[PDB]
Amino acid sequence: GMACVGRTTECTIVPANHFGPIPGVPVGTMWRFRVQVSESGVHRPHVAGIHGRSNDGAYSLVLAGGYEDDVDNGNYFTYTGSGGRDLSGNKRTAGQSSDQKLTNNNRALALNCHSPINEKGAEAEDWRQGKPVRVVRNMKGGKHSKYAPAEGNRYDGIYKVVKYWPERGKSGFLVWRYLLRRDDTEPEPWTREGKDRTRQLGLTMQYPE
DNA sequence: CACCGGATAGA
DNA sequence: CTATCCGGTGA
């Protein structure tokens, strides 16, 4: 029975709208379930792929399979916006049935790219100067990405939005697409250096209390 | 494999 | 107060 559980605690360490790493939660951290990832402060939303405010930016996101148009390339990846979906019947997921829009989190994520928001898409010159995004990789990502962890969720660090643009997805409907490049001072956790570090810090899968 | 709570933002 | 939702089940 994790399908309906809520949080026990919460991150206060830093606020809901903190951009960047949660201090002393290092790259390689593991959580069995999404609720634990919320409690860490690394990705507050329970279910949603993106955490963001549409007038400020996106703080984090999760690569979980979920969306056929995501492409995961490790040190970079193309992420899909949310929405364009009929969730009637109190559903949480479905295949695309309408065009996505530059609103809400899709818009939030756009704001992270170092370039004025633009309805047709934009790219950053100094991408590194755009706002940071904490990236979490989940195991359901592994049907198609070889970077996804075997089990649960993993903090892989800060990436940044190099570019964003709209185009039709596999479904035929418009999707918002986001190129993210890693900008983190610490090794990727699927790397030997990262695996040593994970071990060297005693990181282990965090299961529910 | 139909559909539940809960966490958040935005109105 | 209401809409959204890359989860996670019991079966």
UniProtKB/Swiss-Prot annotation:
Chain positions with Phosphoserine modification: 115
Description of the deletion phenotype:
Mice display a sensitization to DNA damage and replication block, and die in mid-gestation.
Q: In this chain, where does the modification N6-acetyllysine occur?
A: 146
Residues recorded as binding DNA, renumbered to this chain, are 64-65, 70
Domain named YDG: residues: 20-182
Q: Where is this region: Required for formation of a 5-methylcytosine-binding pocket?
A: 67-70, 79-82
Cross-link Glycyl lysine isopeptide (Lys-Gly) (interchain with G-Cter in SUMO2) position reads: 146
Compartments, record wording: Nucleus
Site residues (Required for affinity and specificity for 5-mCpG sequence), renumbered to this chain: 92
Where does the entry say this protein is expressed, by tissue?
A: Expressed in thymus, testis, spleen and lung. Within testis, expressed in almost all cells except elongated spermatids.
Q: Where is this site: Required to discriminate between hemimethylated DNA versus symmetrically methylated DNA?
A: 90
Q: Subunit structure, per the record?
A: Interacts with DNMT3A and DNMT3B. Interacts with DNMT1; the interaction is direct. Interacts with USP7; leading to its deubiquitination. Interacts with HDAC1, but not with HDAC2. Interacts with BLTP3A. Interacts with PML. Interacts with EHMT2. Binds hemimethylated CpG containing oligonucleotides. Interacts with PRAMEL7. Interacts with ZNF263; recruited to the SIX3 promoter along with other proteins involved in chromatin modification and transcriptional corepression where it contributes to transcriptional repression. Interacts with UHRF2. Interacts with FANCD2.
Record remark: domains: The tudor-like regions specifically recognize and bind histone H3 unmethylated at 'Arg-2' (H3R2me0), while the PHD-type zinc finger specifically recognizes and binds histone H3 trimethylated at 'Lys-9' (H3K9me3). The tudor-like regions simultaneously recognizes H3K9me3 through a conserved aromatic cage in the first tudor-like subdomain and unmodified H3K4 (H3K4me0) within a groove between the tandem subdomains.
**Protein's UniProt name:** E3 ubiquitin-protein ligase UHRF1
Organism ancestry: Eukaryota, Metazoa, Chordata, Craniata, Vertebrata
Q: Which residues of the full protein are shown?
A: 405 to 613 of 782
